[PDB]
C-alpha cells in the first residue's frame, strides 16, 4: 500500500471560507495601507499593487495545514511517519486549529498556525531556519503565492518571519487593522498579529491527488 501525497488537517467548508475571506480582506487592506505602498520598492523590483492578483496562485477549494509531505512514499521519512500509531489513530479525527496571525512576503501569503501539544504529536520530526524555533513553528495554511513560487515556500517564509520575531526585530506596529496590529519586518515581509485568534475546524487525513 502506497502513502498519500501528504498528510494534514483539512479545514471544513465553513472554516475554509472564513479563513480564505479573512486572507482576501487582509490582502486588500495591506495593499491599500500607506505603510505598505511606501515600501513597494522593497516588495518588487519593477504606483499601487493589487495583492489579491499578485498572489494569483491560490488554493482552488479546501484549505489545509500540512504536517508531513510524503510524495507517495518517495520523500524521506514518509513511511516512518505514516506507520506511527498517533497518525493512524488520528486519521479521520476532528481537530481545532488556532490561527495567531496572517503574513505576507514577496513570495507567499499565509496564516500562522499554533499547534497544541496533542496536535504536535502529529508533526513530523525530520532546516536551519528551525534553529531556536520550537518544532511545529512552521505550521501554516497557505493562502496564495507568486507566479513562480514552488511548494513548501510558505513554511520557509513563516520560519524566516518568526526568526526576526525571535530577535525582537518585530518593530513597533506601523498601523492598525480591524483584526489587529500590522507589523513591517522589512524585505517585503509583513505580519498581522490577530487580537483575537481564529479557530478553525479541520479533519486530519491524507490527500492522494
Ligand atoms: N518538501 C515539500 N515539497 C512539496 N510540498 C510540500 C513540501 N513540504 C510541505 N509541502 C506541502 O504539501 C502540500 C502539497 O505540496 C502543500 O501544502 C505544500 O506546502 P505549502 O507551503 O502549503 S505550498
Ligand atoms: Cl517547525
Swiss-Prot record:
Keyword tags: Hydrolase, Lipoprotein, Membrane, Methylation, Phosphoprotein, Prenylation, RNA-binding
Entry annotated with the keyword Transmembrane helix: no
Residues modified as Phosphoserine: 45, 53, 169
Active-site positions on this chain: 64, 140
Main subcellular location: membrane
A single MF term (Gene Ontology): 2',3'-cyclic-nucleotide 3'-phosphodiesterase activity
GO BP: adult locomotory behavior; axonogenesis; cyclic nucleotide catabolic process; oligodendrocyte differentiation; response to toxic substance
Subcellular location: Membrane; Melanosome
Family, similarity comment: Belongs to the 2H phosphoesterase superfamily. CNPase family.
Function comment: Catalyzes the formation of 2'-nucleotide products from 2',3'-cyclic substrates. May participate in RNA metabolism in the myelinating cell, CNP is the third most abundant protein in central nervous system myelin.
Protein name, UniProt field: 2',3'-cyclic-nucleotide 3'-phosphodiesterase
Section of the entire sequence shown: 183 to 398 of 420
Amino acid at each position: 500500500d502506497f502513502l498519500p501525497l501528504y498528510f494534514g488537517w483539512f479545514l471544513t467548508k465553513k472554516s475554509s471560507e472564513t479563513l480564505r475571506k479573512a486572507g482576501q480582506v487582509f490582502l486588500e487592506e495591506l495593499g491599500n495601507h500607506k505603510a505598505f505602498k511606501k515600501e513597494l520598492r522593497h516588495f518588487i523590483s519593477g504606483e499601487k499593487l493589487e495583492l489579491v492578483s499578485y498572489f494569483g496562485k491560490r488554493p482552488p477549494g479546501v484549505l489545509h495545514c500540512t504536517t508531513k509531505f510524503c510524495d507517495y512514499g518517495k520523500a524521506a521519512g514518509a513511511e516512518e511517519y505514516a506507520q506511527q500509531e498517533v497518525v493512524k489513530r488520528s486519521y479521520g479525527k476532528a481537530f481545532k486549529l488556532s490561527i495567531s496571525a496572517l503574513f505576507v512576503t514577496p513570495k507567499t501569503a499565509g496564516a500562522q498556525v499554533v499547534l497544541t501539544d496533542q496536535e504536535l504529536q502529529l508533526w513530523p520530526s525530520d532546516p536551519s531556519a528551525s534553529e531556536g524555533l520550537p518544532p511545529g513553528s512552521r505550521a501554516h495554511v497557505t493562502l496564495g503565492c507568486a507566479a513562480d513560487v514552488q511548494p513548501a515556500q510558505t513554511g520557509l517564509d513563516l520560519l524566516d518571519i518568526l526568526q526576526q520575531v525571535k530577535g525582537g526585530s518585530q518593530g513597533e506596529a506601523v498601523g492598525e487593522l480591524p483584526r489587529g496590529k500590522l507589523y513591517s519586518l522589512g524585505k517585503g515581509r509583513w505580519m498581522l498579529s490577530l487580537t483575537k485568534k481564529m479557530e478553525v475546524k479541520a479533519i486530519f487525513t491524507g490527500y492522494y491527488g
